[PDB]
């Protein structure tokens, strides 16, 4: 958030040329640095709106990271090592289970000091679940999907 | 067969008709037919089973793979037209039988063709060891070719068996 302010005094407020500055604007509240900051926010212009020029060609140019993700989208690492990634996962899933299996018996409730003892709310299994199952999911759809189709091409 | 509440589906003949009627079925190959037909039949018990014991056993010797059980002996005591489906029986179920023995058994040599083929004559063995190439020396080798062929449980470089692994992939991530 860019602001652009003027700055003026206190006798100059009185007479009337404060409240000029402040007209034509959309306000918006800050607080960085409590109520003194506010005080002088509100006395320059009050958080004026900054808009930007642009057209949809600079965009563009902007968005895309590289030329070379038209590579790398594809580029796959060795199998074994994807192999591995599979096999590291369900390793880890494995243990957090024991610790689902109390915990389905509610676990919807709010609070977590509260949950830490009723549904193993410690190391929450359900979290920890999740992010082992979202990770897996991708990496093996997109490396066995890259690999099968660049084959294909080639041979 | 079962009409109303029960009208007496019961005859004299009724017996005579379904005999018949069954062994059409087996001959024609409607196997399916025969199984669907029967749940229906309930009114067939009066009329009892010896005209009937000839196309229930048949069945039932063949589905067992009895090749000396499946007699067309029975059923030819009516016979005004009971001969005509013995006949054509005999010629179906033989064929059925040597597709059997061609995966089955490696080497038939002229005196055992009788039973194992369900065929007529050693001779008419031979005959149709010409018709689907069987023959090799004055003894046959078809077992070899067809007992080989079987095996399919076998995977072949990428998933193509349970649909194409690009398009399964992408459907697993898809389902989420």
Same mark, same amino acid.
């Given at each position: 958030?860019?602001?652009?302010?003027?700055?003026?005094?206190?006798?100059?407020?009185?007479?009337?040329?404060?409240?000029?500055?402040?007209?034509?604007?959309?306000?918006?509240?800050?607080?960085?640095?409590?109520?003194?900051?506010?005080?002088?926010?509100?006395?320059?212009?009050?958080?004026?709106?900054?808009?930007?020029?642009? %057209? =949809?060609?600079?965009? $563009?140019?902007? !968005?895309? &990271?590289? @030329?070379?993700?038209?590579?790398?989208?594809?580029?796959?690492?060795?199998?074994?090592?994807?192999?591995?990634? %599979? =096999?590291?996962?369900? $390793?880890?899933? !494995?243990? &957090?289970? @024991?610790?689902?299996?109390?915990?389905?018996?509610?676990?919807?409730?709010?609070?977590?000091?509260?949950?830490?003892?009723?549904?193993?709310? $410690?190391?929450?299994?359900?979290?920890?679940?999740?992010?082992?199952?979202?990770?897996?999911?991708?990496?093996?759809?997109?490396?066995?999907?890259?690999?099968?189709?660049?084959?294909?091409?080639?041979? | 067969?079962?009409?109303?509440?029960?009208?007496?589906?019961?005859?004299?003949?009724?017996?005579?008709?379904?005999?018949?009627?069954?062994?059409?079925?087996?001959?024609?190959?409607?196997?399916?037919?025969?199984?669907?037909?029967?749940?229906?039949?309930?009114?067939?018990?009066?009329?009892?089973?010896?005209?009937?014991?000839?196309?229930?056993?048949?069945?039932?010797?063949?589905?067992?793979?009895?090749?000396?059980?499946?007699?067309?002996?029975?059923?030819?005591?009516?016979?005004?037209?009971?001969?005509?489906?013995?006949?054509?029986?005999?010629?179906?179920?033989?064929?059925?039988?040597?597709?059997?023995?061609?995966?089955?058994?490696?080497?038939?040599?002229?005196?055992?063709?009788?039973?194992?083929?369900?065929?007529?004559?050693?001779?008419?063995?031979?005959?149709?060891?010409?018709?689907?190439?069987?023959?090799?020396?004055?003894?046959?080798?078809?077992?070899?070719?067809?007992?080989?062929?079987?095996?399919?449980?076998?995977?072949?470089?990428?998933?193509?068996?349970?649909?194409?692994?690009?398009?399964?992939?992408?459907?697993?991530?898809?389902?989420?």
């Amino acid at each position: 958030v860019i602001d652009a302010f003027r700055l003026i005094n206190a006798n100059m407020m009185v007479l009337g040329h404060e409240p000029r500055q402040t007209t034509s604007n959309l306000g918006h509240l800050n607080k960085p640095s409590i109520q003194a900051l506010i005080h002088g926010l509100n006395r320059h212009y009050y958080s004026i709106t900054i808009n930007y020029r642009k %057209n =949809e060609l600079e965009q $563009k140019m902007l !968005l895309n &990271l590289h @030329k070379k993700s038209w590579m790398e989208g594809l580029t796959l690492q060795d199998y074994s090592e994807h192999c591995k990634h %599979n =096999e590291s996962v369900v $390793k880890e899933m !494995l243990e &957090l289970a @024991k610790n689902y299996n109390k915990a389905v018996e509610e676990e919807d409730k709010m609070t977590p000091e509260q949950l830490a003892i009723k549904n193993v709310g $410690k190391q929450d299994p359900k979290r920890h679940l999740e992010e082992h199952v979202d990770v897996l999911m991708t990496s093996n759809i997109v490396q066995c999907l890259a690999a099968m189709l660049d084959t294909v091409v080639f041979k | 067969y079962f009409d109303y509440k029960e009208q007496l589906p019961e005859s004299a003949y009724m017996h005579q008709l379904l005999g018949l009627n069954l062994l059409f079925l087996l001959s024609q190959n409607r196997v399916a037919e025969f199984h669907t037909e029967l749940e229906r039949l309930p009114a067939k018990d009066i009329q009892t089973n010896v005209y009937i014991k000839h196309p229930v056993s048949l069945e039932q010797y063949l589905m067992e793979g009895s090749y000396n059980k499946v007699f067309l002996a029975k059923g030819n005591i009516p016979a005004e037209s009971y001969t005509f489906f013995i006949d054509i029986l005999l010629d179906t179920i033989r064929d059925e039988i040597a597709g059997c023995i061609e995966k089955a058994y490696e080497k038939i040599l002229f005196a055992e063709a009788t039973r194992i083929l369900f065929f007529s004559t050693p001779k008419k063995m031979t005959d149709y060891a010409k018709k689907r190439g069987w023959l090799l020396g004055p003894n046959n080798y078809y077992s070899f070719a067809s007992q080989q062929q079987k095996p399919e449980d076998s995977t072949i470089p990428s998933t193509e068996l349970a649909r194409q692994v690009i398009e399964y992939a992408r459907q697993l991530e898809m389902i989420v």
